[PDB]
Structure 1
Amino acid sequence: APQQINDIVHRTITPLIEQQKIPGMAVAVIYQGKPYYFTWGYADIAKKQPVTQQTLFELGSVSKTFTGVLGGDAIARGEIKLSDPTTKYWPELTAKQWNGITLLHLATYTAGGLPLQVPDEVKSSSDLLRFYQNWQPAWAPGTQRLYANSSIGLFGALAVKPSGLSFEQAMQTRVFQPLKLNHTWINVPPAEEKNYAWGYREGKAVHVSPGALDAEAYGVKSTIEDMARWVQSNLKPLDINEKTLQQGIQLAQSRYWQTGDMYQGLGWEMLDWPVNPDSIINGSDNKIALAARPVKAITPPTPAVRASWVHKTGATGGFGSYVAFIPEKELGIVMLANKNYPNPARVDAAWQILNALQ
């Protein structure tokens, strides 16, 4: 890699790892469209297995960027419209509070207070219907953004219904395969488990547990190489030969709502570039990112703006992830770690690196 990249990555990430006690980490810096890879530490501490460019990490909520793009691809196929009512795809959702809640609301956390998590006791399709049938909104739809796995998770499950495919099959056929993300998995196959890093929480090795709508909201695992290719695909959608997927990538970066200086896409979130670094750093703290905030609609949604900072945080019990990129600059970063450490530390490090290379 260019010396300037090696230098800034060492001076930023090695101290981050020292400060946060991260056991293993992989970073890709995309500079002028090309990825440069860096690894540190161990995927499995007790086995002394190093992190490599083939190590699988839990992406956590970064999974929502795949869900948003798959939803965009369905829009581009004419299979769904964001203005469609939820009940078009789930007519058994007969409770009156669902009148007026659209796929857009589900995708963008604006349905009126769907909760952060689907309850752990939801184990069957019957449980899931009961959950949504009994949920009572705190706000009218399209007025407040409250980040929620139960919201975008339902969006992903319903967006694939017209295809007749399961969510996993749709994602594999329509997103992973065309983009050659051949080491990205909703369910890690047995032959690939050797590459699956352990997450570390309070010193103990952990993997994410199964849960309702997990694939849609937080369940994807991937390598640093596939995640760099995911960033390249979102930086340069016109390089994608499949027109519906090219368009789905673009639609996931459209701006549907604004609150403060942030814009909500499908999975992705965006700010105008140049960005105020303190806004992205401070805004990533869970106390802020997860709070209910009023939104203003953008109608029509702003088509993807090249001069944007586009990003997403993610975590599981044992992992912490961050992806950010700037289309106009062909510049991006992926940071995958097997410890969940605070979002602001991730974003600060990412901005120090990308700011140094702009």
Structure 2
Amino acid sequence: APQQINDIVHRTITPLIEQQKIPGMAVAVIYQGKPYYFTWGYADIAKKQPVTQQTLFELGSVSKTFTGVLGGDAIARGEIKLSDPTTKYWPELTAKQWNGITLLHLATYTAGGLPLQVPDEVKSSSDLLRFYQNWQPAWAPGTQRLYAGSSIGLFGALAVKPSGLSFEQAMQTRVFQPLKLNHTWINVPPAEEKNYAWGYREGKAVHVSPGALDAEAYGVKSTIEDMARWVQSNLKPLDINEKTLQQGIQLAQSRYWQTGDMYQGLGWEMLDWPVNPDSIINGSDNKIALAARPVKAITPPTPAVRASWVHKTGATGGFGSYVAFIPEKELGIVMLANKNYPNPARVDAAWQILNALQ
């Protein structure tokens, strides 16, 4: 790595790992379009297996960036429109609160207070229809953003229906394969098991458990190299030959709603560059990130913006991840860890690193 990258990474990440007691960690910095990699510590503490550039991490909610891009690709294919009512794709959803709720609203957390999590007791397709039928809204559609896996999760599941493919098959064939993400999985295969890091939650090694809408909201696992490649793909979509996927990447970075200084995309979230650092750092704390806030209905949505800080935090029980990039500066970062540590610490570290490399 260029010495200016070594120096800031090392000065930033070393105290981060120490303060947060992270067992293992991988970082990629994208600098002038090329990736540079760093690893620390252990994928498997018990087996003393180090973190490598082939180690698989659970992305948690950074998976929602994949769902938003897959969704954009479906829009670009003419399969769906975000203005379509939810009921076009799920006719059984007959209860009257579903009148007015569109694919846009599911995708962008604005349906009117769908919850953060689908309950553990919802397992089957039949359970899921009951869940959404018996749900009653806190607010009217397209008025408040409440961050919610049960919202974007459903968008993902509905969005694939006109393709005639399962969510996983569509993601494989339409996003992972064309982008040459050959070590990114919704279900880790046997050839890869030995590279799947353990997550650590209060000292116990954990992997994420199956749940309803898991693939759609928090299901992806990936390596630092594939994630750097994902950031490259999202920084410079024009390099992508598949026209619908290029366009879908753009649509996911389109600004659909504004809330304070932040914009909601499809999965991705955005702020204007230059950022107010204190704002992205304190905005990432769950007190704010998980709270309901008004959306400036933006009509029509504002197109993607080169001068943007684009990012997404993610966690599972034993992992914490973060991705951010700045298309204007050809700069990016991925941070993957096998402990879930507080969002503001992630964003503070990422800001410390990327501001120094412009």
Counterparts of 1:34 and 1:18, CA distance in 2: 28
Counterparts of 2:346 and 2:259, CA distance in 1: 22
Counterparts of 1:353 and 1:270, CA distance in 2: 18
Q: Partner residue of 1:229?
A: 229
Calculate the aligned-residue CA RMSD, in Å. Answer: 0.4
| Alpha-carbon offset, residue 152 of structure 1 | 0.1
Counterparts of 1:68 and 1:297, CA distance in 2: 19
| Alpha-carbon offset, residue 24 of structure 1 | 0.2
Counterparts of 1:281 and 1:53, CA distance in 2: 27
SS of match in other structure, 2:300? strand
| Alpha-carbon offset, residue 315 of structure 1 | 0.3
Q: Partner residue of 2:26?
A: 26
Counterparts of 1:79-158 in structure 2, within 5 Å, are: 79-158=79-158
| Alpha-carbon offset, residue 143 of structure 1 | 0.3
Counterparts of 1:16 and 1:123, CA distance in 2: 38
| Alpha-carbon offset, residue 219 of structure 1 | 1.0
Per-residue CA deviation, residues 200-245 of structure 1 (Å, 9 max, x unaligned), is: 0000000001000001101100000000000000000000000000
| Alpha-carbon offset, residue 287 of structure 1 | 1.1
Counterparts of 1:118 and 1:208, CA distance in 2: 15
Per-residue CA deviation, residues 101-136 of structure 1 (Å, 9 max, x unaligned), is: 000000000000000000100011110000000000
| Alpha-carbon offset, residue 65 of structure 1 | 0.1
Counterparts of 1:71 and 1:219, CA distance in 2: 16
Counterparts of 1:111 and 1:239, CA distance in 2: 34
Counterparts of 2:230 and 2:214, CA distance in 1: 20
SS of match in other structure, 2:151? helix
| Alpha-carbon offset, residue 297 of structure 1 | 1.4
Per-residue CA deviation, residues 6-40 of structure 1 (Å, 9 max, x unaligned), is: 00000000110011000000000000111000000
SS of match in other structure, 1:282? helix
SS of match in other structure, 1:140? coil
Per-residue CA deviation, residues 51-92 of structure 1 (Å, 9 max, x unaligned), is: 000000000000000000000000000000000000000000
- Output the TM-score relative to the length of structure 2: 1.00
| Alpha-carbon offset, residue 264 of structure 1 | 0.1
Per-residue CA deviation, residues 266-319 of structure 1 (Å, 9 max, x unaligned), is: 000000000000110000001110000111111111110000000000000000
| Alpha-carbon offset, residue 141 of structure 1 | 0.1
Counterparts of 2:301 and 2:126, CA distance in 1: 35
Per-residue CA deviation, residues 163-206 of structure 1 (Å, 9 max, x unaligned), is: 00000000000000000000000000112110000000000000
1:218 aligns with 2:218: yes
Counterparts of 2:228 and 2:300, CA distance in 1: 31
Counterparts of 1:254 and 1:52, CA distance in 2: 34
Counterparts of 1:244 and 1:297, CA distance in 2: 26
SS of match in other structure, 2:13? helix
Counterparts of 2:179 and 2:319, CA distance in 1: 24
Counterparts of 1:170 and 1:295, CA distance in 2: 31
SS of match in other structure, 1:120? coil
Identical counterparts, % of pairs: 100
Per-residue CA deviation, residues 237-270 of structure 1 (Å, 9 max, x unaligned), is: 0000000000000000000000100000000000
Counterparts of 2:356 and 2:123, CA distance in 1: 47
Unaligned runs of 5+ in 1: none
| Alpha-carbon offset, residue 335 of structure 1 | 0.1
Counterparts of 1:59 and 1:323, CA distance in 2: 10
SS of match in other structure, 2:38? strand
| Alpha-carbon offset, residue 142 of structure 1 | 0.2
Structure 1 segments of 4+ aligned residues over 4 angstroms from their partners: none
| Alpha-carbon offset, residue 44 of structure 1 | 0.1
Counterparts of 2:138 and 2:20, CA distance in 1: 37
Q: How many residues align?
A: 358
Unaligned runs of 5+ in 2: none
Counterparts of 1:164 and 1:126, CA distance in 2: 20
SS of match in other structure, 2:116? coil
Counterparts of 1:47 and 1:183, CA distance in 2: 22
SS of match in other structure, 2:7? helix
SS of match in other structure, 2:291? coil
Counterparts of 2:115 and 2:18, CA distance in 1: 35
